[model samples]
Target: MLFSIQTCPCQINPALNAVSTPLLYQDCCQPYHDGLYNQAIRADTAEHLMRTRYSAFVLVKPEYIVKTTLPAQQDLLDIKAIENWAKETDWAGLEVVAHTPKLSKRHAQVEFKAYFKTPDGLQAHHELSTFVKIKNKANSDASWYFLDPTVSMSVTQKQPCICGSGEKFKRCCGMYI
Candidate 1:
């Protein structure tokens, strides 16, 4: 339940909230959400946003990510990283145990479990990720970046739910329904 501290209170964009009820723009990171601010961290919320961002990455919808990051900061992403994920993963399941958005003025890190299906069956990706925000821009949005090279594992029943369902870890995919 540890969280990284941001330079300022995280703001949320109303639009981002509309995507998922479990997450709200202001409840998530509006300033960063609306592109008004550059940095923020609500450890729990960051974990949720991180998951949503991961889904966005797997889907290869750059606009989804760009909408979350500081405008123009989109150039900072590792396109190959995202491409590899889109290609390598069916992106079946993902969940986070802990999150910490670094305190660096323009940098941060996120660690989580990303699960998926392989030729054999189910597996997971445990990663300690790093990210950065754009240097400086008046209306510039904070770049919400994702780090990967996840170490895969078998998902457990006692964990949080996957499938983007937002259900309890044990009740949803845990039963393999």
Candidate 2:
């Protein structure tokens, strides 16, 4: 018997059909993870911050997740628990339901659903997340961070599957259970 080894695409690079930017992983979230692109990419918009944050979760870089969070909020995060969740959950896809960028005083809202697979089955985290910008001297010097995520909604088992397989929820994702 012969076996060939194959590397995970995401392990080689962070971007795999990313939800936001056209840039590749190395250029996109990886730089954010590496602590190199905060000023350049800066995440001037709410959606950009959301996308990069999701990418950080997908890439299992809890450090970046911790770093991007506001200092006050940072105290609430348990890096070990977050790292465990990031490592354990298998991310499937992200869907942005709506985005309202920088409404006033560097505040924004991004409603999104991130799909994932647990040891038990497929799940969706539907949230209306809020973002806040801590601006510096210039617009390019600003950084956006996840403020809070309200459990605005949830996936209904009666609805269509999140995988976009065009199959009924019961038949598609429910079957995984």
Candidate 3:
């Protein structure tokens, strides 16, 4: 396990002036939250953040995905799967609540919960992502890919189910997923 991936945008937005930076939680790495590459200030000198970088993989934004990768080991990627999974996301929100770095120094990890509005309704993806910053790619960024997508249902129907809806799981997102 790497560390937890969570940024206190709503809480720390004041000190960092994250919003006035015109960097809305949605506009910035908040979308990736605790994943790598700082919140946007470039923590290159320090450890690479993992949330947003992990998002890049989920979204198929391979430009940064490829750029941050170690040139020599680039062959270890399966970008297709990343692209496909990202396509599956009906993004509601990507929130990072915390983070931690590994002592090994060779790798860093993050845990986050991402929310989205799927065909099933709104939902969240929670996971711990890990990344290894190749020596020379200091300024370049990368990440550990972990996407734990989950559906948060809120159907008002009530008569038979306990999943917030009165209907059974078979009559809800269970049937959809």
Candidate 4:
């Protein structure tokens, strides 16, 4: 398909039962996926991050998934497993249930259901995912990242946060994760 004519897989803000123009890929998740937006401001909201991550899965971009996850967990991610899953799964659609923007200064929650096709029927992976806003580097501005529940890390509460916020884990993202 021509790049200009391609619709975004995210389908965020679908028209409410009316004829509306579809969101183009360039105007939606592509900027984040392609690194066109500044890292600090890219995916400025947790909901946007979640939507783009879903799009990453649909488009089979495992690297995007790894980059968008909490910085500390990136090294622990099973890239091969993620790639295999993204390639094998038949993604159906996404429905965002709710977005609680401010659980705290650095944390937010997004409840969503991502649908996929299985052998017998469609299945919904329902989750209330946590997100953190933190700088990827010391001097850089903060951006949102998914706090993946599946990846395990060995850090005590007194240790610095995995998000690289320089705050103790217990004082920062640890409260949510």
Misplaced by over 4 Å in model 2 are: 1-23, 36-41, 118-121, 137-140, 149-177
Cα lDDT, all candidates: 0.46, 0.62, 0.43, 0.82
lDDT of 2 by residue, 21-136 (tens): 34456554555555533435456577877877887777677877777775445766788988998888888767777898845444578888888777787678888876666655
Best by TM-score: 4
Q: How far does residue 60 in candidate 1 sit from its true spot (Å)?
A: 3.5
Q: Which stretches of candidate 1 lie over 4 Å from their true place?
A: 1-49, 63-88, 103-105, 139-143, 146-177
Instruction: Please estimate how well model 4 matches the true structure, expressed as its whole-model Cα lDDT.
Output: 0.82
Candidate 3 whole-model C-alpha lDDT, 0 to 1: 0.43
Top lDDT: which candidate number?
4
Model 4, span 1-177: residue lDDT tens: 354357777773322343776688878888788883334348889999999999899888899999888877889999889999998998877888999999988899999888888898878888999999876456766788899888777779998887777899899888887
| TM-score for each of the candidates | 0.43, 0.63, 0.45, 0.86
Candidate 3 segments exceeding 4 Å error? 1-48, 54-60, 66-73, 137-177
Tell me how many residue pairs clash in candidate 3. Answer: 22
How far does residue 172 in candidate 2 sit from its true spot (Å)? 42
- Model 4 residue 133 lDDT score: 86
Per-residue error (Å), model 4, residue 36? 6.4
lDDT for 98 in candidate 1 is: 56
Q: Which ten residues in a row have the lowest lDDT in candidate 2?
A: 1-10
Candidates 1 and 4, the one with greater TM-score: 4
Candidate 4 backbone collisions, by pair: none
